[PDB]
């Protein structure tokens, strides 16, 4: 549900395991999230 929407922005801590998880993921749902997160990387990926 969270991948198939653009109303709620979503990210994770940058330089963390969760960012590293979706970066090297090959699940079709989870690749959509990193396709989302990499575009507006300045906005949704917080520092802590």
């Amino acid at each position: 549900d969270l991948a198939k929407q653009t109303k709620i922005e979503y990210g994770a801590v940058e330089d963390g395991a969760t960012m590293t998880f979706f970066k090297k993921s090959k699940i079709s749902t989870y690749d959509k999230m990193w396709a989302f997160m990499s575009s507006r990387r300045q906005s949704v990926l917080v520092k802590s």
């Binding site: 549900d1 198939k4 929407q5 079709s28 959509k32």
Partner: protein, 48 residues
Amino acid sequence: PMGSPYRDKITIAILQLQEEGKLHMMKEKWWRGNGCPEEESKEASALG
């Protein structure tokens, strides 16, 4: 084009993808959007 060595090679290659379900996996990746909620979402009906 009208006579090519790539017609039969793609005809093999398309049939390989649909028995692996990958033509169905790619269609669900793009055509599935917001979910588009149904008319059975009543949740309240004050009689008027």
